[PDB]
Structure 1
């Protein structure tokens, strides 16, 4: 045998020892999953809800922009629908983490908007389209409106994108916890603590509380080190929640006023161009519920021992090798800590 220390005879062979080792692995994985399930489901629920809520906000804003174009500028439709759809599609793609340039969104929006304004509102009556697109930026026809919208929407969209990425990475690391493979020495120690008593013919004897403590603090020396970074993650997320619904909903007034602004100097513009050519409640409840799990990594060995059958009294218990009267006495973890450091820096820089 290679695990069960044979003091007397033994009722189990080497293959039964391998079976006990695999059952020890499975029991440890089940205990970790039971410890992490509530928090995993909490973060999954909140990620899904916030994603749907942000999509609802974007859809409502696209609908109102299209409706206000239909009502105030029928001469700009159906082209207005095209550039509004492209703008809000790129908005959603940026929110969901795709490489989209916010300044490029606004600039393409105004680049598409100006030629139809010129042809249908200012000078009624396809090849000259690019000359108008160039004149849009070269003559600064929209004034400071494009940069105002650019900063206004970049500020909110970046914080929302990083909020979603933080939720997803919390989901990722909490999923990773219950799949943590341990050392072979820890496998043998868990087999001794949980099952090797059966090899000595004992039926209901439980391991000592102190033996469970030394074993758990033995193989969770790395996992406990995650607690600092997990606490900093929670606190940085709290720093971030303390933005994007109000901004996207005022966009229509700003666009209407920008169109008025361009129409205001039509006299000179036409001649020059003719010559030249409940959310905040949800994130608050989420942070208040997330603060209840700040001790998750520090209380984890305590959980494994308090939910495994152990003799807390340290009397008439199994010490891994014999029944005693009184008890005598990286790589994946490194990746978890790396990702936590990354997300914590990213959080802190936002707020």
Structure 2
């Protein structure tokens, strides 16, 4: 009713000077952002409120992004730590139980096994290695020394003195270790992408659009009004479009990542080789000492649910939950922090007629609330899309045994 007392309240409680707000409505000819009409807002008040709304949206965005980063980091640490512990507990179990069973056979060769575990370790960490060739070399030297303590051209390979254990170990390790490494690496790349995209600032366009969205209701004399859901969604879809462009490759990455988890195990019944290597080694040694005089001429059931299995289930739940993130941002921010027949449509309290825009940069060309340039995409987002592409390629090749 042309008394600005309510607006004076809100402006003052937001920590701005009460000096600048008039007692009655004045001509809004001076308004740059808000639709020109009789208003309680001074230009001062207008730019201040715009700045504030901008800051608020930024804070929201960074909050969401930080939540996502937190989740991804947690998953990363979890899987890395568990893989490494599995390898490690395998080695320590080997060191503990081997001298008893195999005696001097292991006792004299221990450096070979230690070195092998070191090789597997370096491989998981992403060093360049041919695991096939490494294992082959290992079996060659080990066979040499073992044959020497049992009592050049070697007939031995193709006479399979160690049995099927070397083959099993080769296949299983080759699959599982590249699976694990690729998965962890994928988590890392996801985290980095989110962290880098969070840094991309909002433009002046988005600023004026958000100001018109939020506090222009107050300026035009209807401060009790809160934005219509479709209005807010259009404004945010216009602001976040470049971020929305990440959707495709984000989804591809996450899909390939929930795909690669299946390769942590071979086909059914046997526990993952990643923690069970020592076991196949023992199998091989036993098979050799079984073949000792002809040459002179333990892989336990998989538990119904194991640690790695539970971690994988939880992780797949998380990834399935966050796959829609980039396009889910506007609805999420609008639902939680930004917003009953009559609501603020931006010219008055009423209905918002305009149809909601589609996702992505290109779809914002006709966006009524915000003016967006679709010709030049944000190239940071583009960089990150490239990263997603590359990591996805790595994971797809890893899934194919490549």
Structure 1 residues 92, 24: closer, same or farther in 2, change over 3 A? farther
User: 1:195-231, CA deviations, whole angstroms, 9 ceiling, x for partnerless residues?
Assistant: 5566778765544544423321212233333333333
Structure 1 residues 55, 93: closer, same or farther in 2, change over 3 A? same
TM, length-normalised to structure 1: 0.74
Unaligned runs of 5+ in 2: 1-29, 298-305, 355-377
Name 2:114's counterpart in structure 1. Answer: 85
Name 1:225's counterpart in structure 2. Answer: 245
Structure 1 residues 72, 27: closer, same or farther in 2, change over 3 A? same
Name 2:186's counterpart in structure 1. Answer: 166
Whether contact under 8 Å (1:47, 1:167) holds in the other structure is: yes
Name 1:247's counterpart in structure 2. Answer: 273
Give 1:139's match in structure 2, choosing from 154, 159, 181: 154
Structure 1 residues 260, 77: closer, same or farther in 2, change over 3 A? closer
Report the Cα distance in structure 1 between the residues aligned to 2:342 and 2:293, rounded to whole angstroms: 87
Indicate yes or no: 2:94 matched with 1:46.
no
Structure 1 residues 323, 260: closer, same or farther in 2, change over 3 A? same
Indicate yes or no: 2:386 matched with 1:338.
yes
Whether contact under 8 Å (1:240, 1:347) holds in the other structure is: yes
Report the Cα distance in structure 1 between the residues aligned to 2:66 and 2:342, rounded to whole angstroms: 30
Report the Cα distance in structure 2 between the residues aligned to 1:209 and 1:266, rounded to whole angstroms: 79
Report the Cα distance in structure 2 between the residues aligned to 1:179 and 1:160, rounded to whole angstroms: 30
Indicate yes or no: 2:214 matched with 1:183.
no
Paired residue total: 322
Indicate yes or no: 2:158 matched with 1:110.
no
Q: CA deviation at 1:302?
A: 1.0
Whether contact under 8 Å (1:314, 1:326) holds in the other structure is: yes
Structure 1 residues 66, 13: closer, same or farther in 2, change over 3 A? same
- SS of the residue corresponding to residue 163 of structure 1 reads helix
Whose relative contact order is higher, 1 or 2, with alpha carbons under 8 Å and at least 6 apart?
A: 1
TM, length-normalised to structure 2: 0.66
Whether contact under 8 Å (2:345, 2:351) holds in the other structure is: no
Whether contact under 8 Å (2:215, 2:223) holds in the other structure is: no
User: 1:12-50, CA deviations, whole angstroms, 9 ceiling, x for partnerless residues?
Assistant: 449x83x65654453223212333444433333232222
- SS of the residue corresponding to residue 245 of structure 2 reads helix
**Which moves more between the two structures, 36-45 or 297-306?**
36-45
Give 1:60's match in structure 2, choosing from 76, 89, 92: 89
Structure 1 residues 156, 214: closer, same or farther in 2, change over 3 A? closer
Name 1:11's counterpart in structure 2. Answer: 42
- Aligned-residue CA RMSD (Å): 3.6
Name 1:130's counterpart in structure 2. Answer: none
Report the Cα distance in structure 2 between the residues aligned to 1:157 and 1:255, rounded to whole angstroms: 20
Whether contact under 8 Å (1:24, 1:190) holds in the other structure is: yes
Indicate yes or no: 2:200 matched with 1:152.
no
Report the Cα distance in structure 1 between the residues aligned to 2:185 and 2:121, rounded to whole angstroms: 14
Structure 1 residues 6, 288: closer, same or farther in 2, change over 3 A? closer
Whether contact under 8 Å (1:223, 1:297) holds in the other structure is: yes
Name 1:236's counterpart in structure 2. Answer: 256
